[PDB]
Structure 1
């Protein structure tokens, strides 16, 4: 539901966090708060791993366009900061995080997707930073998230050319780690999550931070520089 856009379900060693706002899982304030609250729940349950899913229509269509373009600056800035804060939180999360990309992932939807330790999508799901196509420059925080995962040549095209990836081209590019049929995307993500929960948690938490140190520092800077993007 739009009022209640996130569900949380503990399954033995994992927690499944599912976005469904009835529409395209826009990452506005309500959605961000719902996600953060679900993660707090996973912290409380001390689960072995997280799965985050979209709905049957998309993973996420990104930030809420209504807020972004209402003509009020501070709320748009605040929505942007919160989205990238959440990305930071997922990239630094001390448990394995698996993304079940259950539909298209556009812009912030794709940036959020790129925060998972393991990412599962179906062959025909579009993954795209479409900013340049719609006349926006890609924020530094988003650039750093993408640069952490996309091959050097895919990064060039994904950014400057707003290239759309899917299936095998998304896998080769580093926009996803696993392809599965639509009807088993979630099951495959849960399966992967259960396996990762068997890894040593301390070693995983510590190693992932080392493998992402420079990106996380650059993302923190990008979050604090969001206002400057606007020139504000």
Structure 2
């Protein structure tokens, strides 16, 4: 929403990519462009690991609702495809990816969060696929992302019932991996990233793909199936 919604900072073995559009980090075309460019920077720098953060208010409130509800079909399709493409890129990323969930993560915000190898949040941040609560069916690509992380029963309630998770319930459900106090969420994320950069990169990259093979295939299908959804 702001003109310059993503910052990139390299600190030794890691790259820190921060979303702040001055509002709720809506994942519209400009934000997606800025995130892809930031990842290109990390590629160029051949960093050991990535940390992705939100701002002080949210991790992200999801796709841009203005575009989603504008009545223009192809722009909405393209926004959704771009968001799930970014999810694909992060889930298959050859370096460890750590998410600093610095506030609430709703819908595409929660799906983006769910692409990190490690995810840190504070206890009062809501994580929810709210689609059903607002009259939308969850796209197949999103379901596959959630199915990769959420326990079988948590997955059931997260989808059909739009259940909100947080703190201990998010940890148990598999929506996050670590709970920390708000003031140290980013620091904990950076610490984990520095540790994971110590793993063998080749083995990490190859193994993560094997552990996500079916999901990645289904996500590709889901991306090519977005049009059909509309």
Q: TM-score, normalised by structure 1?
A: 0.99
Pairwise CA distance, 1:106: 0.1
Pairwise CA distance, 1:224: 0.2
Pairwise CA distance, 1:44: 0.2
Q: Equivalent residue of 2:163, what SS? A: coil
2:66 is equivalent to residue 66 of structure 1: yes
Pairwise CA distance, 1:200: 0.1
Pairwise CA distance, 1:52: 0.0
Residues 129-160 of structure 1, C-alpha deviation per residue, up to 9 Å, x if partnerless? 00000000000000000000000000000000
Runs of 4+ in structure 1 displaced over 3 angstroms? none
Give the whole-Å Cα distance in 2 for the aligned partners of 1:33 and 1:95. Answer: 20
Q: Equivalent residue of 1:18, what SS? A: strand
Give the whole-Å Cα distance in 2 for the aligned partners of 1:172 and 1:124. Answer: 15
Q: Equivalent residue of 1:148, what SS? A: helix
Residues 177-229 of structure 1, C-alpha deviation per residue, up to 9 Å, x if partnerless? 00000000000000000000000000000000000000000000000000001
Give the whole-Å Cα distance in 2 for the aligned partners of 1:138 and 1:228. Answer: 13
Pairwise CA distance, 1:14: 0.2
Question: Gaps spanning 5+ residues in structure 2: where?
Answer: none
Q: Equivalent residue of 1:175, what SS? A: coil
Give the whole-Å Cα distance in 1 for the aligned partners of 2:70 and 2:219. Answer: 26
Pairwise CA distance, 1:75: 0.1
Number of the residue aligned with 2:7: 7
Give the whole-Å Cα distance in 2 for the aligned partners of 1:148 and 1:2. Answer: 32
Number of the residue aligned with 1:103: 103
Give the whole-Å Cα distance in 2 for the aligned partners of 1:228 and 1:172. Answer: 34
Residues 82-118 of structure 1, C-alpha deviation per residue, up to 9 Å, x if partnerless? 0000000000000000000000000000000000000
Give the whole-Å Cα distance in 1 for the aligned partners of 2:2 and 2:151. Answer: 36
Give the whole-Å Cα distance in 1 for the aligned partners of 2:120 and 2:224. Answer: 30
Question: Gaps spanning 5+ residues in structure 1: where?
Answer: none
